[PDB]
Paper text:
NHLRC2 (NHL repeat containing protein 2) is an essential cytosolic protein of unknown function, mutation of which was recently identified in association with FINCA (fibrosis, neurodegeneration, cerebral angiomatosis) disease, a multi-organ condition which is fatal in early childhood.
The crystal structure of the β-propeller domain was solved by single-wavelength anomalous dispersion method using selenomethionine substituted protein. Given the high resolution of the data, the electron density for the main-chain is complete and side chain residues are clearly visible, except for a short fragment between residues 346 and 352 where the electron density is missing. In contrast to other β-propeller proteins, the NHLRC2 β-propeller is not closed by a so called ‘Velcro strap’ which is the insertion of the first N-terminal β-strand into the last propeller blade framework. Instead, N- and C-terminal β-strands even though located in close proximity to each other, belong to separate β-propeller blades. The central pore of the β-propeller domain of NHLRC2 is approximately 12 Å in diameter and contains a number of water molecules.
Numbering used by the authors: 219 to 346, 352 to 572
Write the structure that this text describes.
């Protein structure tokens, strides 16, 4: 109980300042820290709530996904079933989607606080300038979008700012890929990462209950298998810990993905296996990058001898030099140096 963090589920990196944003999930607060670990903002706490307003009165409820661009942070405020907006310039928290209770709507289409949502778990910025917030909607097994400005989703017509709706996923809890996004099926999708550039042009999805990684095309929304699971779209009992190509790889409840555009590699928080995996989206090869699989925590080690404990999220740093891991059940951000192949613990001060 001595770490300043408690079960931190997610971490992201600000691309223009190199700051980190940490969802300190168990303390119901969001941290903004400089890359050396010095805290700049602590927003929320100590108890769960859904209060908006100035920073000192704002509260969250077991938040997960965090995304930052241009001094605005969006929060998958999971247990409130809300998307929240932290405006660092104005030092105000606001609510931009959800009604504060768990929705069952598998389609969406309403604006903002008129639209019920269900256990949002991860968020990333996209571009139809950062005018889309993509949402891993774990509660209804779907990928959703919030329009931050008016714009068009892939193959759709323009929708007004604030529209919040399903993009991919039927709503059935399945491991189902499809040429048409509404006919695909996900199973507790919990991690997203954007690869907007050719030849990828996709969102990568950590599909936790199917133990797979999928791609969702930003050209036409086609949902495709990348690694893990089995062919049967109803089989959610297809987990394990196996390095291999495509369908031969086995994951266990992966909660996070992050795209490394420098190396054209995808890193995966393979949470229940206590490992970080690396996927080459070309060869579809999934191999172990770091983690022995045991949960005896060591604070300094090589990649191969490092340990994690259900890491809930991760994010590549600027220019792909460092990989930050929300090492959830160790209450730490682990810093993986991709040049020295060493793992350390981010100090928080």
């Amino acid at each position: 109980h001595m770490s300043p963090l408690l079960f931190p589920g997610k971490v992201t990196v600000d691309q223009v300042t190199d700051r980190l944003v940490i969802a300190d999930t168990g303390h119901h607060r969001i941290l903004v820290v400089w890359k050396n670990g010095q805290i700049q903002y602590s927003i929320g706490g100590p108890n769960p709530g859904r209060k908006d307003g100035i920073f000192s009165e704002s509260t969250f409820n077991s938040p997960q996904g965090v995304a930052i661009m241009n001094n605005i942070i969006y929060v998958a405020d999971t247990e409130n079933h809300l998307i929240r907006k932290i405006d660092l310039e104005a030092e105000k928290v606001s609510t931009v989607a959800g009604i504060g209770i768990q929705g069952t709507d598998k389609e969406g289409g309403a604006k903002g606080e008129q639209q019920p949502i269900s256990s949002p778990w991860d968020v990333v910025f996209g571009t139809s300038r950062g005018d889309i917030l993509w949402i891993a909607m774990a509660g209804t097994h779907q990928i959703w979008a919030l329009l931050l400005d008016s714009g068009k989703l892939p193959k759709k017509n323009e929708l007004t700012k604030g529209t919040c709706l399903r993009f991919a996923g039927s709503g059935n809890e399945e491991n189902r890929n499809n040429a048409y996004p509404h006919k695909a099926g996900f199973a507790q999708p919990s991690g997203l990462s954007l690869a907007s550039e050719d030849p990828w042009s996709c969102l990568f999805v950590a599909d936790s209950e199917s133990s797979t990684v999928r791609t969702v095309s930003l050209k036409d929304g086609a949902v495709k298998h990348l690694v893990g699971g089995e062919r049967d779209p109803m089989n959610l009992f297809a987990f394990g810990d196996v390095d291999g190509v495509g369908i031969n790889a086995k994951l266990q409840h992966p909660l996070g993905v992050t795209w490394d555009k420098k190396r054209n590699l995808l890193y995966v928080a393979d949470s229940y296996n206590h490992k970080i995996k690396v996927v080459d989206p070309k060869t579809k090869n999934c191999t172990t990058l770091a983690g022995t699989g045991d949960t005896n925590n060591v604070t300094s080690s090589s990649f191969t001898e490092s340990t994690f404990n259900e890491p809930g999220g991760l994010c590549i740093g600027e220019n792909g030099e460092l990989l930050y891991v929300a090492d959830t059940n160790n209450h730490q951000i682990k810093v993986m140096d991709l040049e020295t192949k060493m793992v350390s613990v981010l100090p928080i001060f």
